[PDB]
Structure 1
């Protein structure tokens, strides 16, 4: 059965998306926005009080298969939304005024593989012509300085950028959805682990975004807010200098589409457990991350 304080396999997350929607139809609708290479359904949950032409914030989890705390966060967020609506003033205002497009697991095929075969798997599970090597790195597969730095052209490598931008069914599905809804989406948030950071553009080059000052101030305030709960310390900055250059990222792509608030989160920890974060840290990790996401949402809402 499903638990918010355990890592759940895909079969369970899928059953959860159906159950949480059917139990909360006045706050959640579920739509499939595509299939993965292996035929799994890429669900998107629209979280919010239904209404005409609402602005939206897009958040995805599970780009990288082994980053299990990412998948866990998207599920946690959805429950927080549904349970506190009408009682917590901020979340109530949030869901009244906008929609959260929550994509709980993008790279489902890779996630299943980390459960069945290889816990440290990262990429998708698509085949590659001319080789037995499997998979593309989804966060190198977007049309953002595609494959120009920090990415491999070799299908056997963990940062393989693919045969072309959006060569993967999963990344094409996400990009298509965001393109089809550009006019409503005001912020893009993508959840990874680990490192305890909040990153913003650019990562494919050392250039800074026009609203660099604003993004820095927003990231700073969000990490401060996060720390108030349990003392967890994040760092923040442009991706290229804060972690390393990496072209083809979804956050840089989203920004260049005109979405002015675009962030990558790297959750706990700093490497003691790394990707294998104990389930006993799921609750604390998600609760503190909630504060940062809500801080950003509050800011974005005020700036429509």
Structure 2
């Protein structure tokens, strides 16, 4: 049984991607952008009413297997789109004028593993030459100062950068999709947990994006909007100085392709539950996070 207020296993999420598409054909289509190491289809939902030459926002969840609130959020975003389209002026305007690509779970193999074997798994489940240690950090696997800081060369480490940038099937598939849709994708949003932050480039070096001032102000206003609901306190800024320097992240990579609005969201909490955020917090976390995402979306829409 699928529920938006619980964590759902991969079989349930996959079935939900079919059913939500099936039930909302005027707003949702579903493709597979490739397959995982283990051969699972990486589903992608395109959310929006058809129209000509529509710009797009790309959002993924579930890079990191254990960050279950991420996967729940992408699902929540789709829930909102389908529930409030027609009733709420903003979301209606967004879906009429933009398309949202929502990739509910990037690292499916890892996610399955968190359900069957090890709740605290992070990485992919691919093999590494010369060791039995499994997996690559997908957010250290992009071609963005690849493997240079805040990433490990050791395949047994949690931030393992992999054998080469885009060595993972999942990261290759994501990058290929973005590269193939670059002239329409105006913003890239990647959802993680935890520590309550809105981060923007760069993380791979202590350097700042050309539109730093604009990103800073947007991130600040998004954090302010998020707090209006439950008072939840986020920090924000360039990744390297706001969370830690880390190379090979998808947001930095996306920004270096020319996607000017590129953010990583690190959802609740600040460590009390960490990755094991209880189900009772799914609704409040997603709701407040909707406010930030809708704020960013509205900004993007108003500054094309």
- Give the TM-score band, short-chain normalised: over 0.9
The 2-side partners of 1:130 and 1:196 are apart by 37
Give the match for residue 158 of structure 1.
Answer: 158
Structure 1 position 81, deviation (Å): 0.3
Structure 1 position 43, deviation (Å): 0.2
Deviations along 1:172-225, one digit per CA (max 9) or x if unpaired, are 000000000000000000000000000000000001111111000000000000
Unaligned 5+ segments in structure 2 are: none
Structure 1 position 53, deviation (Å): 1.9
Deviations along 1:209-261, one digit per CA (max 9) or x if unpaired, are 11111000000000000000011010001000111100000000000000000
SS of match in other structure, 2:179: helix
The 1-side partners of 2:19 and 2:239 are apart by 37
The 1-side partners of 2:287 and 2:46 are apart by 21
Deviations along 1:69-104, one digit per CA (max 9) or x if unpaired, are 000000000010011111100001000001000000
The 2-side partners of 1:40 and 1:53 are apart by 31
The 2-side partners of 1:67 and 1:79 are apart by 19
SS of match in other structure, 2:121: coil
Equivalent positions of 1:93-132 (< 5 A) are 93-132=93-132
SS of match in other structure, 2:192: strand
The 2-side partners of 1:272 and 1:150 are apart by 24
Unaligned 5+ segments in structure 1 are: none
The 1-side partners of 2:38 and 2:299 are apart by 39
The 2-side partners of 1:178 and 1:114 are apart by 27
The 2-side partners of 1:32 and 1:51 are apart by 22
Q: TM-score of the superposition, structure 2-length normalised? A: 1.00
Two-structure CA RMSD over aligned residues (Å): 0.4
Structure 1 position 50, deviation (Å): 1.1
The 2-side partners of 1:218 and 1:75 are apart by 24
Range with bigger deviation, 61-70 or 50-59: 50-59
Kindly tell me the number of residue pairs found equivalent between the two proteins. 304
SS of match in other structure, 1:248: coil
Give the match for residue 239 of structure 1.
Answer: 239
What stretches of structure 1 move > 3 A for 4+ residues in a row? none
The 2-side partners of 1:173 and 1:46 are apart by 16
The 1-side partners of 2:231 and 2:207 are apart by 32
Structure 1 position 52, deviation (Å): 2.2
SS of match in other structure, 1:119: coil
